[PDB]
Homo-oligomer: A and B are copies of this chain.
Amino acid sequence: DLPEIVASGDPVLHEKAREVDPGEIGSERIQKIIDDMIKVMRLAPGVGLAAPQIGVPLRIIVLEDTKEYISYAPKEEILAQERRHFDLMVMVNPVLKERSNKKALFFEGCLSVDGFRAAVERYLEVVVTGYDRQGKRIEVNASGWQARILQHECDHLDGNLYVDKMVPRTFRTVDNLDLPLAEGCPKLGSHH
């Protein structure tokens, strides 16, 4: 039976997720959880998913952003956002750190808070160490949109949601997503 995404309010979403013992990652139990996360991420088209989002208090995140996913997306947007596809990625016990001080502003959403969006500031490029599916130690360097997904998801592992880190008065309904940014609001884009 495939789990359902839990929403804002459920504590596992706002509480720090504990590590998976490296060596259990190759387990049918954890492997199962990972396959679930991937199935859920794909089943309601999104590009990232963190364990807590399915009631699993473990430090695990998954992400994928496909050519197709992007196929439908304003060429200009794809540009400014610097969104490039990348193969399905799984990371247990990830540890994210910014590679530089360049940032960017764009709208973010979460399957745990649907119907809404909000512009949030993220580092343009980052590095992430941790383990993959088979429990193999890895290091990942990303930038652009993929870098944003990584941050969003990892945040989930420490019980943080975008709504608590969003730009004032940008929060909005999906239907209002592309509405003039109110006077005083920083402008979407990146330093470099």
Contacts and interface: CB of A to CB of B under 8 A. Distances in A.
B163 A9 contact: no
A171 B176 contact: no
Main secondary structure of the interface of A (DSSP, over half): loop
Interface string A100-120: 000000000000010110000
B164 A171 contact: yes
Interface in A160-192: 160-161, 163-164, 166, 168-169, 171-173, 175-177, 179-185
A130 interface: no
Contacts of A184: 15
Given A14-B169, A159-B169, A182-B159, A9 B164 contact: no
A57 to B, nearest CB: 12
A184 B164 CA distance: 14
A10 B179 CA distance: 6
Contact of A10 (B13, B15, B176): B176
A8 interface: yes
Interface residues of A, number: 32
A7 interface: yes
A7 B161 contact: no
Interface of A: 7-11, 13-15, 113, 115-116, 159-161, 163-164, 166, 168-169, 171-173, 175-177, 179-185
7 contacts: A7-B175, A9-B177, A11-B183, A113-B171, A113-B173, A159-B182, A164-B166
